[PDB]
Design an enzyme around this catalytic site. Structure first.
Site, PDB file in Angstrom:
ATOM      1  N   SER A 146     -66.606-121.248   8.670  1.00 53.31           N
ATOM      2  CA  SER A 146     -66.798-120.139   9.604  1.00 53.31           C
ATOM      3  C   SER A 146     -68.138-120.269  10.325  1.00 53.31           C
ATOM      4  O   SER A 146     -68.393-121.367  10.848  1.00 53.31           O
ATOM      5  CB  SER A 146     -66.737-118.835   8.780  1.00 53.31           C
ATOM      6  OG  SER A 146     -66.505-117.717   9.611  1.00 53.31           O
ATOM      7  N   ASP A 201     -55.728-118.995  12.520  1.00 53.34           N
ATOM      8  CA  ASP A 201     -57.067-118.472  12.247  1.00 53.34           C
ATOM      9  C   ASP A 201     -57.704-118.006  13.562  1.00 53.34           C
ATOM     10  O   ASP A 201     -57.656-118.704  14.573  1.00 53.34           O
ATOM     11  CB  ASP A 201     -57.878-119.563  11.557  1.00 53.34           C
ATOM     12  CG  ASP A 201     -59.297-119.244  11.199  1.00 53.34           C
ATOM     13  OD1 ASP A 201     -59.710-118.092  11.472  1.00 53.34           O
ATOM     14  OD2 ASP A 201     -60.057-120.092  10.670  1.00 53.34           O
ATOM     15  N   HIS A 258     -58.038-117.493   8.102  1.00 53.90           N
ATOM     16  CA  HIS A 258     -59.380-117.987   8.049  1.00 53.90           C
ATOM     17  C   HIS A 258     -59.914-118.137   6.622  1.00 53.90           C
ATOM     18  O   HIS A 258     -60.896-118.872   6.407  1.00 53.90           O
ATOM     19  CB  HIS A 258     -60.238-116.924   8.756  1.00 53.90           C
ATOM     20  CG  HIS A 258     -61.668-117.320   8.885  1.00 53.90           C
ATOM     21  ND1 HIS A 258     -62.004-118.546   9.448  1.00 53.90           N
ATOM     22  CD2 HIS A 258     -62.824-116.685   8.586  1.00 53.90           C
ATOM     23  CE1 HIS A 258     -63.316-118.636   9.455  1.00 53.90           C
ATOM     24  NE2 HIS A 258     -63.840-117.527   8.948  1.00 53.90           N
TER      25      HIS A 258
END
EC number: 3.1.1.3
Length: 269
Positions: A146, A201, A258
């Protein structure tokens, strides 16, 4: 679609990225072994994996993560942690660019990511180079999930070209700059960038292309479901800048996709 060796690397660096979330790995003694709670980094624990440097809320953007030694795999691993509260970081993400001619000509990076890296750069680069002179045969790998993935990508870009190659492995990384920087990340020597994404995602879809962004190529796209084990046949390699056959498709994205890269990631307390 991906070999077994590259798959095993994808798997391993996702655990190094996951480990960065565990709060205990952000303020640990050098020399100590890297463990994860919730059975979230067994492969890292199997290795002779010890801390070199541990960090938390450093510089401008609360840079958290660790620099690790792996005597088993022969790696010096810089693991950037993502945001402590992913959902919140997402909805308050600023999309501004700023010129980063220092890294490449005509290139513009996300102001936030680029500034955050710059904050800790001199410190983190020194530590990395100490390990490189101590372990001259270990390979430098930068990783992150991320927001950590963007940090690792921009950090790799900047530090390459100093005598040691740097491979980047990013999990669910947002776009990190303009077209010129995407082309730069696509063809830069002194290391390979392995940009991994998962189904739909949301995070690799931001900031939007409309804000002047582009993704580097290629893309390693996991087709297997949230909560489902990945096998080497579930990852397709998609080539081309801003390609549309993988994560960049016109459908509704999801936040849960994600959090699932090989196993759970971003959730370790």
């Amino acid at each position: 679609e991906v070999s077994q060796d590259l798959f095993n690397q994808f798997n391993l660096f996702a655990q190094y990225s996951a480990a960065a979330y565990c709060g205990k790995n952000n303020d640990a003694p050098a020399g100590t072994n890297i463990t994860c709670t919730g059975n979230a980094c067994p492969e890292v624990e199997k290795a002779d994996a010890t801390f070199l440097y541990s960090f938390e809320d450093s510089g401008v953007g609360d840079v958290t993560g660790f620099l690790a030694l792996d005597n088993t795999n022969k790696l010096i691993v810089l693991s950037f942690r993502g945001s402590r509260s992913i959902e919140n970081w997402i909805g308050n993400l600023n999309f501004d660019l700023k010129e980063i001619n220092d890294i490449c000509s005509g290139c513009r990076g996300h102001d936030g990511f680029t500034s955050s890296w710059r904050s800790v750069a001199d410190t983190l680069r020194q530590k990395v180079e100490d390990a490189v002179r101590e372990h001259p045969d270990y390979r430098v790998v930068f990783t992150g999930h991320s927001l950590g993935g963007a940090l690792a990508t921009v950090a790799g870009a900047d530090l390459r070209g100093n005598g040691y190659d740097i491979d980047v492995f990013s999990y669910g990384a947002p776009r990190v700059g303009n077209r010129a920087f995407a082309e730069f990340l696509t063809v830069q020597t002194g290391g390979t960038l392995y940009r991994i994404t998962h189904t739909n995602d949301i995070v690799p879809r931001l900031p939007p292309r409309e804000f002047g962004y582009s993704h580097s190529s290629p893309e390693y796209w996991i087709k297997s479901g949230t909560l489902v084990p990945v096998t080497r046949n579930d990852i397709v390699k998609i080539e081309g800048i801003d390609a549309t056959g993988g994560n960049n498709q016109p459908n509704i994205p999801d936040i849960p996709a994600h959090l699932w890269y090989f196993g759970l990631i971003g959730t370790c307390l």
